[PDB]
């Protein structure tokens, strides 16, 4: 679990969005596993606007932060699951690191701010849904 709170927006993994997120829907994209809902309170987070390929992410299954080198956002194949058919997930960044399904929502940060959230992984890999291209989150 986890979310980004920026301005009057809440960014979550689309597969973990609650009934309240869908009732306050701003935007969603199944191909990116992202959903953004509106909030009444002002958020605590800053979004990175950069091309960093290193950063640190929070891993709830280890209660620890880990440093990572990750690939640029791209289209990556993800197997079918209970929430999605087998498909290419877009705007995904991979790195070598530990992750389990419940780690989705952990934040990846660089020196500039929030880069994305954990969305996929397996076998010593961790994948992050990028949010740096969503310029409208800042306004």
Ligand X SMILES: COc1ccncc1CC(=O)N1C[C@@H](C(N)=O)C[C@@H]2CCCC[C@H]21
Binding residues for Zn(2+): 50, 52, 110, 112
Instruction: Put the strands of the sheet holding 74-78 in their side by side order.
Output: 64-69, 54-59, 107-110, 113-122, 125-130, 87-96, 74-78
Q: Is there binding between residue 50 and Zn ion (CB under 5 A)?
A: yes
Of residues 136, 126, 90, 91, the one with CA closest to residue 106: 126
The answer to whether residue 44 is catalytic is no
Listed ranges 5-13, 36-44, 48-56, 93-101: which one lies at the site for Zn ion (CB under 5 A): 48-56
> Is-catalytic flag, 15?
yes
Nearer of residues 48 and 92 to Zn ion, judged by Cβ: 48
Backbone φ, ψ for residue 109 (5° rounding): -125, 150
Q: What are the tokens at 134?
A: 């969503």
Shortest spacing between CB 53 and Zn ion, in angstroms:
9
Q: Which does 119 bind (CB under 5 to 8 A by kind): Zn ion, ligand X, none?
A: ligand X
């Amino acid at each position: 679990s986890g979310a980004i709170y920026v301005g009057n927006y809440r960014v979550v993994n689309r597969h973990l969005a609650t009934h309240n997120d869908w009732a306050n829907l701003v935007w969603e994209d199944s191909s990116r596993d992202l959903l953004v809902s509106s909030t009444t309170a002002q958020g605590c987070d800053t979004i990175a606007r950069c091309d960093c390929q290193t950063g640190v992410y929070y891993c709830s299954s280890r209660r620890k932060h880990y440093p990572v080198s990750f690939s640029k956002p791209s289209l990556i194949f993800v197997e079918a699951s209970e929430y999605y058919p087998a498909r290419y997930q877009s705007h995904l960044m991979l790195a070598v690191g530990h992750s389990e399904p419940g780690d989705c929502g952990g934040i990846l940060r660089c020196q500039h701010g929030v880069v994305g959230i954990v969305s996929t992984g397996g076998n010593g890999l961790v994948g992050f849904a990028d949010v740096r291209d969503l310029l409208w989150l800042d306004e």
